[PDB]
């Protein structure tokens, strides 16, 4: 609301102080940035009508999105001016996935405001969930006027990428796993060392998955406060070394298996029944997560079918280590 009148009263072309940044650049990005709005102007409007019948509206959504895009870019560039060398500043300003991700974020804000949302806009712009993820926090941090409900919504996009969308096949997340700080830092990362993107994503995933584990242990496993850290160590040893199981799957399916699992090898016998019912009570939870779980070659079954097939089949060598004389040393709980 307070933001939405900034946009309509403002103009659809870059500010005059934003354009300075374009011209302090060693390669002026402007015509490329500007061809970029126009080329996406076609594609967006096209796919817009392809889902909403017909009315003209597509263009107004976009032309607001664009004003937000420039307002946030201008605000983002002000901070990165001090952080980046002139070389990085100019590479940023010509990086396609950067600018695409920033605009995809602007557009999601307006579309959601006037509510076919997330991850709709990623399919429209042929933008990998994991690339787009990198712009979300510095975007929230770069628009003061985002409303609670809007901030809360971008955060839920972030949590859906961390929980599933970044774990689908052809997602660059797996390319980065095999090999082994702001949005610019992550877009400037070369595809060719450290990888700040993968690091921040994993640190964030762990805090997410761990808060979801922690509530679920306070309902069903309050009896043994000690079972939590064990279940967490299992999940964390799973995400780090058997990460291939999250492909085309959902973070919460691994949280659930790590819980029945540790109650299985300690003879606690609080079975999948209570787990799924209590999980329904997690915010935004969907029943499909446990009723519909992949095994292999597109064949889906229930969560108990997954536990006894791929999860147990991959982890028996490790899980029994927990109830033995020498159980593995504990993982740290995320800060």
Numbering used by the authors: 383 to 437, 440 to 499, 512 to 576, 600 to 611, 642 to 784
Give the published text:
The retinoblastoma tumor suppressor (Rb) is a multifunctional protein that primarily regulates the cell cycle but also has roles in cellular differentiation, DNA damage response, and apoptosis. Essential functions of Rb occur through its pocket domain, which is necessary for regulating binding interactions with E2F transcription factors and transcription repressors that bind via an LxCxE motif. The pocket domain is the most highly conserved region of the multidomain protein, as well as the most frequent site of mutations. Protein X-ray crystallography of four missense variants reveals how mutations destabilize the protein fold and inhibit E2FTD or LxCxE binding.
Missense variants within the hydrophobic core of subdomain B, such as I703F, I703V, M695I, and M704V, show reduced stability and temperature-sensitive binding to E2F1TD and E7LxCxE. To understand how these mutations induce such effects, we crystallized M704V. The crystal structure of M704V reveals changes to the packing of the hydrophobic core of subdomain B. Specifically, M704V introduces new steric bulk in the form of valine’s second gamma carbon. This forces alternative rotamers of F684 and L688 through changes to a van der Waals contact network. Although, it was not clear from the structure of M704V why E2F1TD and E7LxCxE binding are affected by this variant, since the mutation site is distant from binding sites. While Rb’s M704V mutation alters the hydrophobic core energetic ground state by reconfiguring several buried residues, these changes must also have structural consequences that extend beyond the hydrophobic core. Additional experiments are needed to elucidate the structural mechanisms through which changes to core packing translate to E2FTD- and E7LxCxE-binding inhibition by some RbP variants.
